[PDB]
Amino acid sequence: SGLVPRGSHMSTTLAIVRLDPGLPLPSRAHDGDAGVDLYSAEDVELAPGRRALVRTGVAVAVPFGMVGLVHPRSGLATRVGLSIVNSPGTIDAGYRGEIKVALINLDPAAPIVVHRGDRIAQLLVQRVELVELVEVSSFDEAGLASTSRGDGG
Amino acid sequence: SGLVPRGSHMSTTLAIVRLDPGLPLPSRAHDGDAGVDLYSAEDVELAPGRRALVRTGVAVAVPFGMVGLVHPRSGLATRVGLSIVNSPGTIDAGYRGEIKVALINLDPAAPIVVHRGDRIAQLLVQRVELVELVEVSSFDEAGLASTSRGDGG
Amino acid sequence: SGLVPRGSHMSTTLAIVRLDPGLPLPSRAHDGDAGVDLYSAEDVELAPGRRALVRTGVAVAVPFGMVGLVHPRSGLATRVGLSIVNSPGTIDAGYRGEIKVALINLDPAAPIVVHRGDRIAQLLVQRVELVELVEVSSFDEAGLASTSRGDGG
Numbered sequence: 001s002g003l004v005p006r007g008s009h010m011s012t013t014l015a016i017v018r019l020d021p022g023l024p025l026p027s028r029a030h031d032g033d034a035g036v037d038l039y040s041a042e043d044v045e046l047a048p049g050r051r052a053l054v055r056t057g058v059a060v061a062v063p064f065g066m067v068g069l070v071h072p073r074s075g076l077a078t079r080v081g082l083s084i085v086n087s088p089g090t091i092d093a094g095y096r097g098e099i100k101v102a103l104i105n106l107d108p109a110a111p112i113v114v115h116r117g118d119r120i121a122q123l124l125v126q127r128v129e130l131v132e133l134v135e136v137s138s139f140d141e142a143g144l145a146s147t148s149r150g151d152g153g
Numbered sequence: 154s155g156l157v158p159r160g161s162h163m164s165t166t167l168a169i170v171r172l173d174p175g176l177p178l179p180s181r182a183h184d185g186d187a188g189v190d191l192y193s194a195e196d197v198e199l200a201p202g203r204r205a206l207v208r209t210g211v212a213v214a215v216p217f218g219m220v221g222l223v224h225p226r227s228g229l230a231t232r233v234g235l236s237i238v239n240s241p242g243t244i245d246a247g248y249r250g251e252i253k254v255a256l257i258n259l260d261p262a263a264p265i266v267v268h269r270g271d272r273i274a275q276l277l278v279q280r281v282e283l284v285e286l287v288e289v290s291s292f293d294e295a296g297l298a299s300t301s302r303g304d305g306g
Numbered sequence: 307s308g309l310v311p312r313g314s315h316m317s318t319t320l321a322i323v324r325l326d327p328g329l330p331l332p333s334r335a336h337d338g339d340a341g342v343d344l345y346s347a348e349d350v351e352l353a354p355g356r357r358a359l360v361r362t363g364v365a366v367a368v369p370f371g372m373v374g375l376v377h378p379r380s381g382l383a384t385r386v387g388l389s390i391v392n393s394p395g396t397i398d399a400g401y402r403g404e405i406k407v408a409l410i411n412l413d414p415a416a417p418i419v420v421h422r423g424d425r426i427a428q429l430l431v432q433r434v435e436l437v438e439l440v441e442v443s444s445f446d447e448a449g450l451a452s453t454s455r456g457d458g459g
């Protein structure tokens with residue numbers, strides 16, 4: 001329906017330009033899914049170990065105070081070793097260019113064929129803290145020293 | 154204590170089924186830690202460059218409006234080159250199956266042995282924006298054109 | 307200005323120690339950007355397939371209820387195959403040590419040279435749900451069974 005539901009009265013609008021209108025709008029595969037699936041605008045073959053920067057045919061306007069995040073899909077990751085070099089890719093609120101996906105073939109022997117119209121990644125949108133750094137001479141200064149860890153990870 | 158603290162009165166409940174009750178419940182290694190560590194239910198050896206889909210023995214119910222995120226652990230990543238092909242793995246609110254982790258050995262020469270009961274990943278839970286896409290013919294239309302970047306990244 | 311703006315009255319402070327004060331404070335490359343870029347404190351050469359744990363010269367105090375996330379930069383990922391083994395790296399609220407970045411060269415043939423003072427990663431800060439796990443015998447118990455997916459992903 002065109003009626004915005006009760007709880008979800010503050011659902012976030014994402015403006016999108018289909019730079020390649022031959023591709024469907026990105027969509028959630030199932031209700032409640034965190035991401036919308038991005039399509040490839042191109043046919044690409046990746047030999048083992050090779051990477052490509054693949055156009056998705058879309059540009060978005062992530063709201064200020066938020067971030068878009070490009071995540072790999074789990075099925076292709078396991079079945080053929082498809083990954084994303086810079087995962088999770090960070091799409092900034094001021095970016096108005098085309099979203100591109102840095103696919104890489106992490107299989108040792110079998111090439112990966114991507115066809116135009118395949119779903120090759122997923123886009124999440126989340127709030128981000130735009131932090132103000134405060135340089136301190138030590139954490140005790142800031143009142144932040146004794147912790148559950150310390151300088152240990 | 155069983156008393157929910159002052160500030161943290163709205164702590165998020167995560168329902169979990171131990172499909173493999175021989176494994177401990179996932180836990181935070183230290184107070185304030187972002188994730189709970191996931192266990193492997195199986196023994197697995199990964200030769201250099203090989204990947205596996207590893208059962209964790211748990212199923213969860215991420216709340217609607219949230220997402221579960223499967224992240225690698227830093228120590229194994231550096232010491233032996235252990236990574237996750239689809240990192241960060243995206244666990245959707247409607248998913249009720251077993252959480253699986255797509256481990257991969259990014260070392261060139263040394264095999265990685267995973268034992269049942271090892272902590273092989275960490276699970277974070279975060280809010281996500283379930284966005285409504287609005288297709289526009291250009292960002293100016295939406296009142297969103299002139300930015301700190303432009304189509305540049 | 308020193309005046310905190312209207313909307314952004316609740317901007318998050320991140321205390322930071324420059325363990326290596328010869329490096330600039332991390333900064334956002336453009337307004338609205340989700341992350342601040344982390345510098346390398348060292349010169350490092352990565353042969354194809356090799357990884358290193360690289361010091362960034364900073365320690366931070368992520369607030370309780372938040373997480374720091376270390377993400378790769380897209381340009382180096384595509385141009386030279388630079389990635390991060392444990393991406394996204396998880397920086398916990400109680401951590402007070404130096405932030406380190408697990409760089410890896412995913413190119414098959416060309417070495418990557420990192421110079422002291424190069425920007426080698428980006429740090430985001432986000433809220434995280436510090437969840438309370440509730441073990442249930444099945445999701446129906448919790449009132450959470452019938453979904454848009456089921457045990458299917």
Ligand SMILES: O=c1ccn([C@H]2C[C@H](O)[C@@H](COP(=O)(O)NP(=O)(O)OP(=O)(O)O)O2)c(=O)[nH]1
Pocket residue numbers: 152153182225226227228229376392394395396397398399401404405406407408
């Ligand atoms: O990219 C990273 C990730 C982690 N770290 C630090 C901060 C984090 O709080 C700490 C622990 O991270 P992990 O939980 O990913 N590592 P692991 O589980 O191996 O070790 P620990 O026992 O300390 O949790 O390591 C970094 O410096 N860089």
Ligand SMILES: O=c1ccn([C@H]2C[C@H](O)[C@@H](COP(=O)(O)NP(=O)(O)OP(=O)(O)O)O2)c(=O)[nH]1
Pocket residue numbers: 070086088089090091092093095098099100101102305306335378379380381382
């Ligand atoms: O997966 C991605 C990541 C980034 N991008 C675009 C959007 C983002 O806002 C822009 C910059 O991303 P990075 O900061 O990760 N890249 P880098 O730091 O190399 O370049 P810049 O100088 O533009 O920040 O690149 C994509 O199209 N796909």
Ligand SMILES: O=c1ccn([C@H]2C[C@H](O)[C@@H](COP(=O)(O)NP(=O)(O)OP(=O)(O)O)O2)c(=O)[nH]1
Pocket residue numbers: 029072073074075076223239241242243244245246248251252253254255458459
């Ligand atoms: O690391 C992960 C990622 C996903 N999953 C499960 C939960 C998630 O909700 C489900 C689907 O994840 P993806 O969307 O990344 N996979 P894909 O798009 O290939 O399949 P689907 O058609 O089910 O969306 O797979 C895991 O068990 N581990």
Ligand SMILES: [Mg+2]
Pocket residue numbers: 029073122
């Ligand atoms: Mg999917």
Ligand SMILES: [Mg+2]
Pocket residue numbers: 182226275
């Ligand atoms: Mg840990």
Ligand SMILES: [Mg+2]
Pocket residue numbers: 335379428
């Ligand atoms: Mg950048």
